[PDB]
Amino acid sequence: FEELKFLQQLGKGNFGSVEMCRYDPLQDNTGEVVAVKKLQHSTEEHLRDFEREIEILKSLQHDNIVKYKGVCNLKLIMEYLPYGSLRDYLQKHKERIDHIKLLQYTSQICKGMEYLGTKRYIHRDLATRNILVENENRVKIGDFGLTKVLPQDEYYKVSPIFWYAPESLTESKFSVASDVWSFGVVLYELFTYIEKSKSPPAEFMRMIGNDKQGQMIVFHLIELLKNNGRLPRPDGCPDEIYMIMTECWNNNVNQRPSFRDLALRVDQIRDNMAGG
Numbered sequence: 001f002e003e004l005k006f007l008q009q010l011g012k013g014n015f016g017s018v019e020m021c022r023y024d025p026l027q028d029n030t031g032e033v034v035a036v037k038k039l040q041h042s043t044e045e046h047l048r049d050f051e052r053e054i055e056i057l058k059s060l061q062h063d064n065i066v067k068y069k070g071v072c073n074l075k076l077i078m079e080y081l082p083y084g085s086l087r088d089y090l091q092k093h094k095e096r097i098d099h100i101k102l103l104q105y106t107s108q109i110c111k112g113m114e115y116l117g118t119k120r121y122i123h124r125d126l127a128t129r130n131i132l133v134e135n136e137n138r139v140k141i142g143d144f145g146l147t148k149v150l151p152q153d154e155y156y157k158v159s160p161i162f163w164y165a166p167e168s169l170t171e172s173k174f175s176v177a178s179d180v181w182s183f184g185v186v187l188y189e190l191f192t193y194i195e196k197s198k199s200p201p202a203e204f205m206r207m208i209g210n211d212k213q214g215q216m217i218v219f220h221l222i223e224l225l226k227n228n229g230r231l232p233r234p235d236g237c238p239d240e241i242y243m244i245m246t247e248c249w250n251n252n253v254n255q256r257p258s259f260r261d262l263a264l265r266v267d268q269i270r271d272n273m274a275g276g
């Protein structure tokens with residue numbers, strides 16, 4: 001990929017940055033526009049981590065995963081998605097998005113995670129902020145900066161604590177079952193329509209009490225999660241789908257559902273409420 005005209009920035013993070021660029025190979029100003037992700041503090045440690053991430057994305061080919069384009073301090077060139085993040089899209093089209101459309105997005109997030117498991121990859125950052133919208137009918141998982149290849153010899157011991165599983169908060173352990181936990185949180189968001197007042201951090205802080213800060217919030221989030229304290233059922237959210245959230249939020253890692261089973265449940269529910 002040829003050294004690209006920085007049109008505008010799409011996403012800015014602490015160590016990462018995603019901008020929209022134009023290839024313009026023949027300098028005809030007609031080359032397709034791509035999404036370029038570069039590191040903020042291009043260190044030696046981050047460069048090594050950022051190098052793996054490029055290898056993981058180029059190894060993934062799925063309808064609900066952003067298609068890698070190539071490389072160009074290195075730069076990661078990806079597919080550009082015009083509708084941006086799902087939480088920006090959903091908030092701007094709430095009244096035009098029903099539960100069936102909601103379950104469509106849920107179903108293809110599920111299958112993308114299913115495919116992810118096949119390669120033995122743990123995403124570790126499953127949230128609506130990392131879900132991009134290509135058109136009004138297809139969303140994709142857009143970031144893999146925290147993804148860790150499961151070792152050859154079932155978990156990876158290594159932050160968005162309000163999306164984390166209890167074993168990740170305590171033992172710093174991440175697995176497919178920890179991604180299942182975070183998926184249930186993603187399902188929670190999906191049905192609150194990205195209302196900030198009902199966001200998981202805003203909801204957990206009211207249950208914990210906001211006279212707490214620093215790492216003492218993590219202390220009380222652990223004690224609350226261990227005492228069967230969970231995010232409430234969002235209003236309008238059917239009972240059957242709220243149970244999927246609770247099933248993902250089981251303290252016993254062994255009883256959390258699989259991603260293949262969630263995709264079939266989501267599809268069955270979506271078709272059942274579509275045909276009456």
Ligand SMILES: CCS(=O)(=O)N1CC(CC#N)(n2cc(-c3nc(Nc4ccc(C(=O)OC(C)(C)C)cc4)nc4[nH]ccc34)cn2)C1
Nearest residue numbers: 010011012013016017018035079080081082084130142143
């Ligand atoms: C770790 C921090 S991070 O910096 O590295 N980081 C955040 C991250 C989360 C994820 N995934 N992100 C991805 C994109 C992104 N956006 C797009 N299209 C658009 C199109 C329109 C708009 C827009 O209207 O602007 C507003 C502010 C949304 C209204 C924005 C984006 N296409 C993409 N292709 C690949 C990535 C990507 C932006 N942020 C990756």
